Design a protein around this ligand. Structure first.
Ligand code: HEM
Ligand code: HEM
Ligand SMILES: Cc1cc(N)nc(CCc2cc(CCCN(C)C)cc(F)c2F)c1
Ligand SMILES: Cc1cc(N)nc(CCc2cc(CCCN(C)C)cc(F)c2F)c1
Ligand SMILES: C[C@H](O)[C@H](O)[C@H]1CNc2nc(N)[nH]c(=O)c2N1
Ligand SMILES: C[C@H](O)[C@H](O)[C@H]1CNc2nc(N)[nH]c(=O)c2N1
Ligand SMILES: [Zn+2]
Lengths: 413, 408
């Protein structure tokens, strides 16, 4: 591989030079003959596999604190090596846990929000043993992160994988989501994306109120045991009713959304260790709600009903009636969040911040992996600065990875 | 491997086998993806490429292994020997042109790929000849608004010292002028090319929508200027169905999109002048041409007339104005009976095209970064379509600007 790689911005002419790609680890999925850059998703480790992964991470940690080669560096290397020899694993210091989590965010190529990567609150939950403990930890996370609408980014890290039969997992894909319900007639109440998970929850004991915006219970798995259900206290679930600054009829659609986006189905890999329950949360970019959640045809799919209330001609696609309503729906979501003093960022501000971040990373770090397909917002793409920015995608570690759905792998006791 | 692509809205899964036949590079490796990078002979390299192309041509007319096939491979081998190159048969020229379009990963319009009028211009020797051939192209493809796809193929490269090149990047574009106060009149993307036209004799009217002259290079000689007869240049005043003040913005665009800076490669041969044209997708004009900050950049003005609050971005004033600008373009071409397609129709057509290519051909190389329209992405069906990108030949490739390589 060539040592220097250039990226250009076609709107400003700015050329950046990437050397960080030389530290790439796992596979993109691409080859020199095929590019999989639009593919969404393109047993444990052995002593011999773990040794070099830990050393790589420990080296990198001591490089960052400007102690590379020090006595504390070599002593940590030897302690780690001795520990892998006697137990086939090792335990991270708190300092290394925090560094690793912040860098998995920093390295998350699909995240436009990374300007904030070093302001992450890390909750060490590695002493947790039961699903009730997991509930306690997550409740405290949600309350801290919500902060009465002054949202603060945070991660709670549960115990790492051991033999693969004792995994901690949050079975929810996100900590806060609305249920969806299949009716006998084929229609769907609530969020259609969550019909499968809702059905699991119901069979597990949950009593569904069967509304359009029912907050799902937490389904928590500790130490490989069968998952258990918990209701998040509703006063911890901050929500925003959606209204429009001009269209007084917009509130009559009964739309609302929750304030905290909190991914809980991903795996955090640090130094070869696997943290299979590591829920992390930030704050929303408006398009995640106004464009995808509300206007995807497989989701709440409100474009038609907004278009009718807007009295648009909906017989020709070339009237752009869909595009017009999409803008108005996204004006309402940003307006409703700002009026309630709940942190949100529009797609224009977040992509300008990301460009500034990317440029600083190239300056100070030698690069910034970014997945263009995910960084570019789902509306108005080319009037945001990221559209015109060339990006290199590669995988650095520590990182967040996908993992199988726990109901597909769990062995029921 | 047989690779699978999933549509995340419909859950339709297709299976790609066609990628097994690529061999040109993508630019990516297992460790670094370059999917968002815009720009990632001799007798001995030439025959295997000629062979593969003849093989796929005779396989496409279902006469693989025919005597005609055999005699063609021998005919081509002898000619590469005596002459160091070879000439395509007319049937191979047309087949190669249509398949370079069929294989263009970045083109959302490929449902039309086999309906292409091919103009053989390989007998051309002078810039006057090129001008004639180009005028006939423009007149043919424009067709009084009922646009028809077309390509004009000038002589292939011989030694690189005698290239045919259209120096315009597109046959019809508007000039751009640097103003003394620092701002730009016209199209800022064409400032330098306009300066090269002026420095060579073109007298500019110095307006906002001056059709540029043609700058044509024949057989490696210096380029010569020509004005396309104005009755050949179809233009559309832009107006809005609801906002009667929109026509007062003074906006217009040309009807015919015609790329003239690319290289057509067929069986190892290189056609450095191959102007090709189709019809516009509305967003090409309304989003990029009009609202790119480095182009006509009219968002601020439209939002002014719309009285929108332009104090904070979160009012989405740019997004509102952008939609109204794109309504006007579609309404104007439609009112003037000039072929245009909106990004909803075009992307729907492309999904259907992919479905067709997967069944009958085993895949469709496609560049998600280019296929998804520059506005309202996720409400078009291609946003949710996984695509595999790989390089099939014949193909259109980029080439250096001639003002950076031509020896005067
Ligand atoms: C603080 C403000 C943040 C903003 C504005 C932000 C923005 C975004 C957006 C818009 C996406 C795309 C999500 C989608 O389309 O489904 C995303 C993805 C992602 N973000 Fe961030 N994010 C933030 C915080 C965080 C934090 C705190 C972390 C981790 C510690 C993180 C890690 C990720 C990851 C891993 C993804 C990829 C998810 C996937 O592949 O499905 N983000 N971010
Ligand atoms: C017939 C209607 C057509 C439509 C609606 C259409 C649509 C498009 C669009 C929207 C793009 C992206 C343009 C840009 O962003 O610069 C594109 C690119 C492209 N088109 Fe098509 N096109 C059509 C016809 C054709 C024809 C006739 C050919 C060749 C014979 C062709 C070959 C290509 C190629 C090679 C590109 C990539 C250009 C580049 O990399 O700059 N297209 N097309
Ligand atoms: C930390 C953080 C900050 C921020 N702004 N956004 C995110 C993503 C939040 C999120 C993502 C998805 C995607 C589901 C999978 N997708 C393929 C459909 C669904 C949600 F309900 C949700 F809340 C995370
Ligand atoms: C056959 C065909 C059909 C169709 N619909 N569109 C096209 C593109 C036409 C086109 C493209 C560009 C891009 C310039 C480079 N870009 C990176 C800024 C500039 C133009 F003036 C122009 F006319 C071709
Ligand atoms: C097929 C395609 O990769 C898929 O639709 C992706 C495209 N880009 C995306 N970008 C974001 N931020 N989120 C998504 O869910 C997607 N979906
Ligand atoms: C950086 C990025 O590759 C560049 O902006 C691309 C993105 N996608 C595009 N898609 C189309 N159709 N046309 C373009 O000019 C571009 N520009
Ligand atoms: Zn790639």
């Amino acid at each position: 591989c060539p040592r220097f790689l250039k990226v250009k911005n076609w709107e400003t002419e700015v050329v950046l030079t990437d050397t960080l790609h030389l530290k790439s680890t796992l596979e993109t999925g691409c080859t020199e003959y095929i590019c999989m850059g639009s593919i969404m998703h393109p047993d444990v480790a052995t002593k011999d596999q773990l040794f070099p992964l830990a050393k790589e991470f420990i080296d990198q940690y001591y490089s960052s604190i400007k102690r590379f080669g020090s006595k504390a560096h070599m002593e940590r290397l030897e302690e780690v090596n001795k520990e892998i020899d006697t137990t086939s694993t090792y335990q991270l210091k708190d300092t290394e846990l925090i560094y690793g989590a912040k860098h998995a965010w920093r390295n998350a190529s699909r995240c436009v929000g990374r300007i904030q990567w070093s302001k992450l609150q890390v909750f060490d939950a590695r002493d947790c043993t039961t699903a009730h403990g997991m509930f306690n930890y997550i409740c405290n996370h949600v309350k801290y992160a919500t902060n009465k609408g002054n949202l603060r980014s945070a991660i709670t890290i549960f115990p790492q994988r051991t033999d693969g039969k004792h995994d901690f997992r949050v079975w929810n894909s996100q900590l806060i989501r609305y249920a969806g319900y299949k009716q006998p007639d084929g229609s769907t109440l609530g969020d259609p994306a969550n019909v499968q998970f809702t059905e699991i929850c119901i069979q597990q004991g949950w009593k569904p109120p069967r509304g359009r915006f029912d907050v799902l219970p937490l389904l928590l798995q500790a130490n490989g045991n069968d998952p258990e259900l918990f209701q998040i206290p509703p006063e911890l679930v901050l929500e925003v009713p959606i209204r429009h600054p001009k269209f007084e009829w917009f509130k009559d659609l009964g739309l609302k959304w929750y304030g905290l986006p909190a991914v809980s189905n991903m795996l955090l890999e640090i130094g070869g260790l696997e943290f299979s329950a590591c829920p992390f949360s930030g704050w929303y970019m408006g398009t995640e709600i106004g464009v995808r959640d509300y206007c995807d045809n497989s989701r709440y799919n409100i474009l038609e009903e907004v278009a009718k209330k807007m009295n648009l001609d909906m017989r020709k696609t070339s009237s752009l009636w869909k595009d017009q309503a999409l803008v108005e729906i996204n004006i309402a979501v940003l307006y409703s969040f700002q009026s309630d003093k709940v942190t949100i960022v529009d797609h224009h501000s977040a992509t300008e911040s990301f460009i500034k971040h990317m440029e600083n990373e190239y300056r100070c770090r030698g690069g910034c992996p970014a997945d263009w397909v995910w960084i570019v917002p789902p509306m108005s793409g080319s009037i945001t600065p990221v559209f015109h920015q060339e990006m290199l995608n590669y995988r650095l570690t520590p990182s967040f990875e996908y993992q199988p759905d726990p109901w597909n792998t769990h062995v029921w006791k």
